[PDB]
Design a protein around this ligand. Structure first.
Ligand SMILES: CC(=O)N[C@H]1[C@@H](OP(=O)(O)OP(=O)(O)OC[C@H]2O[C@@H](n3ccc(=O)[nH]c3=O)[C@H](O)[C@@H]2O)O[C@H](CO)[C@@H](O)[C@@H]1O
Ligand SMILES: CC(=O)N[C@H]1[C@@H](OP(=O)(O)OP(=O)(O)OC[C@H]2O[C@@H](n3ccc(=O)[nH]c3=O)[C@H](O)[C@@H]2O)O[C@H](CO)[C@@H](O)[C@@H]1O
Ligand SMILES: O=C[C@H](O)[C@@H](O)[C@H](O)[C@H](O)COP(=O)(O)O
Ligand SMILES: O=C[C@H](O)[C@@H](O)[C@H](O)[C@H](O)COP(=O)(O)O
Ligand SMILES: N[C@@H](CCC(=O)O)C(=O)O
Ligand SMILES: [Mg+2]
Ligand SMILES: [Mg+2]
Lengths: 652, 653
């Protein structure tokens, strides 16, 4: 679910320049949802733009944004030549987790057949049923099955029952949000208020970009209960409502990050907040594929760089020092606690499984790793002396965020491992670490996993920096981190060999990925990737659990991938490999280069370079990232837009 | 794999009766799986015994015990009518390890071409290579590739180099086991020690059954290190001994058994049983509650079917004497002397493998609710790999039907080394995990003969719930919750019968999935364990790719598998996760999924919007897992039957 609108005040833009800016913004947000899309702009074909703000046009269509960009064009009624000196256009791409992704269920919604109020909504209204009944009794007919329509039919109810003839648009929206429950990020547009936009939020992101060749009046809009942000001397200004910074960085790097219950409004081209204007620390290059055919491919092959950015200014190899600035004012108190709890979903949960063993080694504390959804279902006991970690690339996952607030209520020290500054999880955690992996566009997490991995390793290195007995072990790990980027490059150089393997598996229905110890997480994450983008039925199986049932599923026809690395479980893994073979299995073994024994007795082997036992998981998962990528291409699927879902689960 | 020996001392038995007893003992051990079998007994057709105590005869063969019995009666020269006042017969079923299924590689293994010594073995001699090379250098020729044969040749070497002409049979075996490495359960017989038996074990179970119409000298055999010291009939000599690697082969003759422990050397000399060690303590003669009827299929065509459909009975057996529905009290006898110390611990760790681990997942939430302590559930193999931190105030539970699973046992010893309180949840009296735990509960589900865990899972479930009810018996705020749970247990056996009465509905579902290669089983909360266990059963029994998926994880990736062709089974019960499960259902249907829903009998909302629905009755939320897993037990059973599979035949090792 993404939001984008374009308000050009006294900046002449033709109807083709605004429609091509609305679509260009949705593409920046398409990875957050691509089941449907829509736009809402001014209609009418009058040369004088002032005689057209009373007619609203909605173009919504099923499919990605490319299905909408083609529905906007080749229209016989919309003349794409009218010059608009003041105009407001709202757009929205939708992740349809329920119901059909039909044009009626897409946004912007409408309050009536004449489109007096259209709204784009991100989130859920937890009481849209009671609001739908109240509105149906007063004489409002509903058309869609979404919860967003109860916001459009309600802003018109506050307008049809206003006390004065000139009630500000803010007042109409302020009365609506007072009847809306749950979370929402809204951007309204009405014919009665031509050119005026209103942007309120509550538990959902929403920022306002600004671009103007003229000086701005202030650099800190004062909240209300010498006041508005507007260009000095002249009126030319361009605003960019958006639920993300990627859709705004392309045009400007001056945004206003609203807060919960802040009702922003642009009236006569002046932005006022009812109830900061900072620069963005992002470059446009960070959200571009570059020379890669897909964001996922880029983000996999850039892992040597993102790993380095994660350690930048934090790891000093000349003296073997680890300093995480985000934990400077808390590391001492974290060490007085008695238990570590890692809470996350999906791939972020796998990062905790991947580092659980080393955290237990270097901190000597119990480490519990919990899936957020199940953590909440069970009402897990949490205590004042627990340290609870929350791994979230987006920093907005609903279940992970609920676990955070759950633990905070019980007095635990909360730590965030996030990749999005200013995100809910990052803000509401007591402390934490920004993994500095850069924007992740592909739906499937690749560099986020390995960067979370490295981040939790550095934390462990801090927790034992005062133990004489562990000094040697710390050097081993840190030397491994120094060599890790180049070893990742060595793994990426086997891309062709991985692609060849994919041609031998793309036709199969299932594949079992097996590992243990440090590589339990590897086979779980690999099985998840193959599920998500190739749609093969891949399942991770703890190697030690084969003999207890799952081994019965193995025969000469069942594809099997095993991970056998040079650590303390090598012998146990060799035993599991012998089991798979005795059952007639013909497995592909991800093993170490020097592992001559395995390489000789196995036809298909992916030989990764050696590393420290607690870092090898980073090198063993990358082949599975690549394998899923190639399998998806062979089966004819888009690796950046897998089916049935999108990126970041910000609604439960 | 299977060991059985029968020693009649001054209990006259004919050679026919002896051989029938040996064969009958192996039939109780066939369910373990085997490829070869054989027997060893006194040869010679001279009227009156004793003169026949120098001609040990062997009859071994490759195949089933049936073929062995047929062979036993195909011996022309053999006279089956000779009466024996004293006689020892040993017998064995083999699971080939070091050698191919063959007659020569079958047990018993002999020490020479005249059968001066014979031995039956369960286990592996790791250092048999060095031993074989040594014996050959001393002039001992081998005839088989078995590691067992080294045991037979070595005991004769010790005999050929004995210091005195009257060194005991025990002393010889003591010297043999000092050279063996690995695991072994052994029974020895020799012409030089007629009528005597020596049994010893290390890392493999071995028990002795005893029967006599006369008073026995004791019920606690004292250990003798290197007469009130041994077991025997007091006023008369008549007695019968039964060595066995599993009580199923003894219970029909006697329920008085002695469980041997590692490095024990049990010897029967002049009809008297003593136990020696090299290192007061003693071994107890105890009474098993087991009955022959419990290891028979009865009218069921398979043990899997029996143990699924008898779960109303086994659940009652788990609760018998432990629950009182009048005053709402739970008393687990095995925890009387430890419950108060457990309540002073600060964390629960459940450690297990496979379905036993699922039992922990299935009861984690209620344990957290009623104990209010953190509850960690760990897979034993991974628990060991990570060197999981364990502390003195941890209470560690070990769930194991057999009580012998290697990784669960090693986890038990891991936690004992760190001073943790260890608690066993087991279904095998005398098992390693049952003995070595400080305390525990025998779930009393009866022997599990089927390949897959069916009643053991549900009996472990009920047992852990009963323990949770003990932990909170002093909390006023929880009295009502305890009553709700206990009235649910009261109703539980009848609710199971209700679920089993839907068997016809499960077969229709088995038909729908007959040709399918995958199936996703989705649930959350109390039914996360249900999905995992159902997915394992269908993997183990049906050999199709069934996978359990936590419903709350669908939107994080796995939902990409849903389409119009992927079979899906969703579990939607009426507990606090109901709305979230409905959410997951809408997510699946939106992506062209057409799932079969296991739901509550009176969930009219979902029954009407879903084509096929398995409608189980309602129970307390923390018990529904027992009712919702049974349809998945039956689904796995019927699918395998439709595909021609033998549900009592293990496909893996
Ligand atoms: C956002 C920011 O300006 N970071 C600066 C900080 O990085 P530095 O690495 O020192 O700290 P982080 O960027 O990781 O986190 C910034 C602050 O947000 C908090 N936090 C972070 C993540 C989370 O999930 N929860 C949470 O509470 C941290 O505790 C910390 O107080 O010093 C560096 C200089 O050495 C600068 O290069 C970085 O620009
Ligand atoms: C084995 C035995 O004779 N149990 C008797 C016991 O049952 P009862 O129910 O009282 O106790 P259990 O059978 O569960 O366990 C027996 C003993 O073994 C210990 N133990 C058991 C399982 C385990 O995994 N770890 C462990 O240490 C128990 O702590 C206990 O000391 O009294 C009942 C009479 O009321 C009898 O019907 C049972 O025959
Ligand atoms: O490849 C799968 C995705 O990366 C997915 O598993 C993701 O990790 C979660 O849906 C939310 O995780 P975040 O909170 O870290 O975004
Ligand atoms: O159907 C599952 C199998 O029965 C198996 O998974 C079982 O649960 C354990 O692997 C055996 O160990 P225990 O005997 O200790 O339960
Ligand atoms: N290791 C012995 C005995 C195996 C067993 O049946 O336990 C063999 O292979 O002959
Ligand atoms: Mg913070
Ligand atoms: Mg005990």
């Amino acid at each position: 679910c993404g939001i984008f609108a374009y308000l050009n005040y006294h900046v002449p833009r033709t109807r083709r320049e605004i429609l091509e800016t609305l679509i260009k913004g949705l593409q920046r947000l398409e990875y957050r949802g691509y089941d449907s899309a829509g736009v809402g702009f001014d209609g009418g074909n009058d040369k004088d733009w002032e005689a057209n703000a009373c007619k609203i046009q909605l173009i919504k269509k099923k499919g990605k944004v490319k299905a909408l960009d083609e529905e906007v064009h080749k229209q016989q009624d919309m003349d794409l030549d009218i010059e608009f000196d003041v105009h407001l256009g709202i757009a929205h791409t939708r992740w349809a987790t329920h119901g059909e992704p039909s044009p009626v269920n897409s946004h912007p919604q409408r309050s009536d057949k004449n489109n007096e109020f259209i709204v784009i909504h991100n989130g859920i209204i937890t009481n849209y049923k009671d609001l739908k009944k109240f509105l149906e009794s007063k004489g409002y007919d509903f058309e869609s099955e979404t919860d967003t329509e109860t916001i459009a039919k309600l802003v018109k109810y506050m307008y049809d029952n206003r006390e004065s003839q000139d009630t500000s648009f803010t007042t109409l929206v302020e009365r609506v949000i007072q009847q809306l429950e749950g979370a929402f990020a809204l951007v309204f547009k009405s014919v009665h208020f031509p050119g005026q936009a209103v942007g309120t939020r509550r538990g959902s992101p929403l920022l306002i970009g600004v671009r103007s060749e003229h000086k701005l009046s202030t650099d800190h809009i004062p909240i209300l209960y010498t006041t508005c942000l507007f260009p000095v001397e002249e009126k030319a200004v361009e605003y960019y409502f958006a639920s993300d910074a990627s859709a705004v960085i392309e045009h400007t790097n001056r945004v206003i990050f609203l807060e919960d219950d802040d009702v922003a409004a642009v009236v006569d081209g002046r932005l006022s907040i009812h109830r900061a204007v900072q620069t963005l620390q992002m470059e446009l290059q960070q959200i571009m594929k570059g020379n890669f055919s897909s964001f996922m491919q880029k983000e996999i092959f850039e892992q040597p760089e993102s790993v380095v950015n994660t350690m930048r200014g934090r790891v000093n190899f000349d003296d073997y020092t680890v300093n995480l600035g985000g934990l400077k004012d808390h590391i001492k108190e974290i060490q007085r606690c008695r238990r570590l709890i890692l809470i996350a979903c999906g791939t972020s949960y796998h990062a905790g499984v991947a580092t659980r063993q080393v955290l237990e080694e270097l901190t000597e504390l119990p480490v519990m790793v919990e899936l957020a959804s199940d953590f909440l279902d069970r009402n897990t006991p949490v205590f004042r002396d627990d340290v609870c970690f929350f791994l979230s690339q987006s920093g907005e996952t609903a279940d992970t965020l609920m676990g955070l607030r759950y633990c905070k209520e019980r007095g635990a020290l909360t730590v965030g491992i996030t990749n999005t500054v200013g995100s809910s999880i990052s803000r509401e955690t007591d402390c934490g670490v920004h993994i500095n992996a850069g924007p992740e566009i592909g739906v499937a997490s690749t560099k986020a996993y390995t960067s979370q991995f490295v981040s939790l390793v550095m934390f462990a290195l801090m927790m034992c920096d005062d133990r004489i007995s562990m000094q040697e072990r710390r050097k081993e790990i840190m030397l491994g981190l120094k060599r890790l980027p180049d070893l990742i490059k060595e793994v990426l150089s086997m891309d062709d060999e991985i692609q060849k393997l994919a041609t031998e598996l793309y036709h199969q229905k299932s594949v079992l990925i097996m590992g243990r110890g440090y590589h339990y997480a590897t086979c779980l994450e690999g099985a998840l990737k193959i599920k998500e983008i190739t749609y093969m039925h891949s399942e991770g199986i703890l190697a030690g659990e084969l003999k207890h049932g799952p081994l019965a599923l193995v025969d000469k026809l069942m594809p099997v991938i095993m991970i056998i690395m040079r650590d303390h479980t090598y012998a146990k893994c060799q035993n599991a490999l012998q089991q798979v073979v005795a059952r007639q299995g013909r497995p592909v073994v991800i093993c170490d280069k020097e592992d001559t024994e395995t390489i000789k007795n196995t036809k298909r082997t992916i030989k990764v370079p050696h590393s420290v036992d607690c870092l090898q998981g980073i090198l063993s998962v990358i082949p599975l990232q690549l394998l899923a990528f190639h399998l998806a291409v062979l089966r004819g699927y888009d690796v950046d837009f897998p089916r049935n879902l999108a990126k970041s689960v910000t609604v439960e």
